[PDB]
Ligand binder design. Structure first.
Ligand SMILES: NC(=O)C1=CN([C@@H]2O[C@H](COP(=O)(O)OP(=O)(O)OC[C@H]3O[C@@H](n4cnc5c(N)ncnc54)[C@H](OP(=O)(O)O)[C@@H]3O)[C@@H](O)[C@H]2O)C=CC1
Length: 158
């Protein structure tokens, strides 16, 4: 199993604000969709609520501690370990957030597909800091703007 973390962040690793995105970057949404199609996607309960409904054509997996919580079109697991344990036969598992899930997944992450925006936004939640010595850059594609801010597609392997 390859554990992959996919997230869009700014220059200071900001990811959210009032349970929403602080930006809208169409290029990232298409990138995200192609990368995640046909794979299991693991998310926190707040991140699901942020989306509002299951992402189509994908096995949506939601992590929560609420034991009686039912979510149509999603598989519920009561810890990240239980989810990963259930997805043992899967060749790849994609962790999509949020901040708490990323922090717990980071030490077990094999791969990271990060969108880094060249801008400084206002927000409250951040992507966890990773040790640059443990990760190597496998792909880096920078884009200028049209997507009103500059961004890059950074792919890291541990
Ligand atoms: N830029 C990007 O790519 C992304 C940005 N975001 C942003 O991040 C924010 C949401 O993230 P965040 O606020 O950190 O919330 P999370 O999405 O991390 O979800 C938190 C909730 O998930 C459950 N949970 C998390 N970890 C565990 C665990 N180890 N065991 C059991 N349950 C767990 C809990 O649910 P419960 O309370 O029900 O027990 C908890 O309250 C939003 O603003 C969103 O816009 C999110 C994803 C991607």
């Amino acid at each position: 199993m390859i554990i992959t973390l996919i997230a869009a962040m700014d220059k200071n690793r900001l990811i959210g604000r009032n349970n929403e995105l602080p930006w809208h970057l169409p290029a990232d949404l298409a990138h995200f969709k192609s990368i995640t199609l046909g794979k299991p996607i693991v998310m926190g309960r707040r991140t699901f609520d942020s989306i509002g409904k299951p992402l189509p054509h994908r096995r949506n997996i939601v992590i929560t501690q609420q034991k009686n919580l039912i979510i149509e079109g999603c598989d519920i697991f009561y810890s990240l370990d239980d989810a990963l344990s259930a997805l043992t036969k899967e060749p790849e598992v994609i962790i999509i957030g949020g901040a708490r899930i990323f922090k717990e997944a980071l030490p077990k992450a094999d791969k990271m597909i990060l969108t880094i925006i060249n801008h400084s936004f206002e927000g409250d939640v951040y992507f966890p800091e990773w040790n640059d010595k443990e990760w190597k850059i496998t792909s880096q594609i920078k884009h200028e703007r049209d997507n009103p801010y500059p961004f890059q597609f950074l792919e890291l392997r541990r």
